[PDB]
From a paper:
Chronic wasting disease (CWD) is an incurable, fatal infectious prion disease that is found in cervid species including deer, elk, moose, and reindeer. Here we report a 2.8 Å cryo-EM structure of CWD prion fibrils from brain tissue of a naturally infected white-tailed deer (Odocoileus virginianus). Like recently solved rodent-adapted scrapie prion fibrils, our atomic model of CWD fibrils contains single stacks of PrP molecules forming parallel in-register intermolecular β-sheets and intervening loops comprising major N- and C-terminal lobes within the fibril cross-section. However, CWD fibrils from a natural cervid host differ markedly from the rodent structures in many other features, including a ~ 180° twist in the relative orientation of the lobes.
Using helical reconstruction, we obtained an overall resolution of 2.8 Å for the CWD fibril core. We used the final reconstructed 3D density map to build an atomic model of the CWD fibril using the PrP polypeptide sequence of residues 92–229, a span of residues consistent with the known protease-resistant core of the CWD prion. As with the structures of the known rodent-adapted prions, the CWD fibril cross-section comprised a single PrP molecule with major N- and C-terminal lobes (called N- and C-lobes, respectively). We have defined major motifs comprising the N-lobe as the E motif (in reference to its shape), hammer loop (also shape), and central strand, while the C-lobe contains the disulfide arch and C-arch. The N-lobe of the CWD fibril was quite distinct from those of the rodent-adapted prions, both in the complex convolutions of the polypeptide backbone and in the ~ 180° rotation relative to the C-lobe within the plane of each rung. The hammer loop was wide enough to create a pore along the axis of the fibril, with a 5.7 Å gap between the opposing sidechains of R139 and R151 in the model. The β-strands (β1 and β7) in the more C-terminal portion of the central strand were terminated by a salt bridge formed between residues D181 and K113 (the only buried lysine of the CLC). The individual rungs of the CWD fibril were not entirely coplanar, which created a staggered interface between the N- and C-lobes formed by residues 109–113 in the N-lobe, and 219–223 in the C-lobe. At its base, the CWD fibril contained a disulfide bond between C182 and C217, which was surrounded by a patch of hydrophobic residues. The overall shape and width of the CWD disulfide arch were most similar to that of the murine wild-type and anchorless (a) RML strains.
Author numbering:
A (entry chain B), B (entry chain D), C (entry chain A), D (entry chain C), E (entry chain E): 92 to 229
Amino acid sequence: GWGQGGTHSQWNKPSKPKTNMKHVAGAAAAGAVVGGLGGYMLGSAMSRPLIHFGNDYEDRYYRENMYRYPNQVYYRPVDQYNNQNTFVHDCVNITVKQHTVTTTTKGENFTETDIKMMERVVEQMCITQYQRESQAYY
Amino acid sequence: GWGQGGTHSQWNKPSKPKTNMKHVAGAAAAGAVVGGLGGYMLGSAMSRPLIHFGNDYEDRYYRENMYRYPNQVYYRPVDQYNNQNTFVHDCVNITVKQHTVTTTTKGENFTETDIKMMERVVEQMCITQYQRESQAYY
Amino acid sequence: GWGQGGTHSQWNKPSKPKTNMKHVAGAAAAGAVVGGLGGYMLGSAMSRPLIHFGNDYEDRYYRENMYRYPNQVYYRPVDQYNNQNTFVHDCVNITVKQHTVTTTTKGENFTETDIKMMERVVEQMCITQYQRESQAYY
Amino acid sequence: GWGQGGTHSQWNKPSKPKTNMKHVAGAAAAGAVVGGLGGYMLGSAMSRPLIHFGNDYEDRYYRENMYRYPNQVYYRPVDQYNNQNTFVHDCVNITVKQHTVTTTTKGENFTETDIKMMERVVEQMCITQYQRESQAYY
Amino acid sequence: GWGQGGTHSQWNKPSKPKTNMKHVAGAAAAGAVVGGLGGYMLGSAMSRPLIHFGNDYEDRYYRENMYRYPNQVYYRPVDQYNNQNTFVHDCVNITVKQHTVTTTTKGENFTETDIKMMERVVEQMCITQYQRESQAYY
């Protein structure tokens, strides 16, 4: 007539995490867990992987049992070329340019005029602004 | 007549996570879990994978049982070329350009005029703005 | 008639984490856990991996049992070429340029004019601004 | 009729962590734990990895049991070329340039004019500003 | 009828950590723990790794048991070339330049004018400013 107390356990219990950041790449933030027996596991081999939050009871009576390589993980990869990649390209290769190429041969008594006005061409770009009861003036 | 207390357990229990960020690539954020016995697992082999939140009871009586390689994971990949990739291209290869090519040969007594006015051409671009009771003036 | 007290345990219990940062790459921040028996594990092999928050009871009676290599991890990878990478490119290769190429051969009595006005061309770019009851004037 | 007191234990219990930083690369900050039996483990092999927050009871009676290499980790990788990398490129290769190339051969009695006005071209860039009841004037 | 008192133990218990910093690379800060039996462990092999916050009870009666290499870690890596690196590039290769190349051959009675005005071209860049009831004037 024994007794085990109930388990109220948290692998991650962050209370009121107020966080301001920009980039979360390959990481964990704002009270987040990257995988329980998992996550980013490109090549894996797990024998008898068990997750049970409930109570566990085992009453085992093993007699003369021949266990030959139980839960064996024969991890023998050959020439494994696997790609599981995350690519994020934001505002890349942005160009605001004015280019002029001049190739004049034996130009006599000639006038060359090259005017490239560039005014108020881009006022805003990639403005990741979060506003809450706020004001922004540009 | 024993007793096991009930389990109230959370792998991730974030309370009121207030977070501001821009990019979450290949990561975990805002109280999120990347996989329980899973996630981003391109090549995997799991024998008897079990998840049960409920209570577990086992009363095993094994006698003279021959278990030959139980739950065996024969992980032998050969020439595995697999691709599971996430590609995000936002506002990439954006060009605002004025280009002029001049190739004049023995130009005599000639006038060349090249005017490229560029005014108020792009006022806003890629403006990821979140507004809540706020004001923005451009 | 014994008794084990209930377990209220947290692997990470941060209370009110107020944090300001910019980049979280391959790390942990704001009270976040990178993996419980997991995370970023590209090549892994785990035999009998078990996670159970509940109480555990075991009553084992093993007699004359032949256990030959139980829970064996035969980790023998050959020529494993795997890629699980996170790429974040934000505001990369941004160019605001004015380029002029002049190639004049035996130019006699000629006038060359190259004017490239560049005014108010980019006012803002990559402005990751978080506003809460605040004001910004540009 | 014995008794074990309940365990209320935290691997990391930071209370009210108020932190200001810029970059968290391959590290831990703001009360965050990088992995419990995990984290950033590219090549791993763990036999019988067990995590249980609940109480553990074991009543083992092993008699004449032949355990040949139990929980054996045969970690023999050959030519393992694996890449699990986090790449963050923010505001890289940003160029604001004015370039002129002049190549004149036997230019006689000619006038060359090269004007490149550059005014108010970029006012702000990569401004990671967090505002709370604050004001910014540019 | 014995008794063991409950354990209320913390591997890291920082109370109200108020911290201001810039870079946390490959380190620990703001009351953060880098791994419990983990962290940044590129190549690892652990036999029977166990973490249990709950109470542990063991009543073992082993008689005539042949344990041949139990929990053996055969750590024999050959030609292991693995990369798990964190790369953070912020505001790198930023160039604000005015370059002129002059190559004149036997230029007779010619006027060369090269004007490159550069005014108010970049007002702010990489301004990682955290504001709380504050004011900034530029």
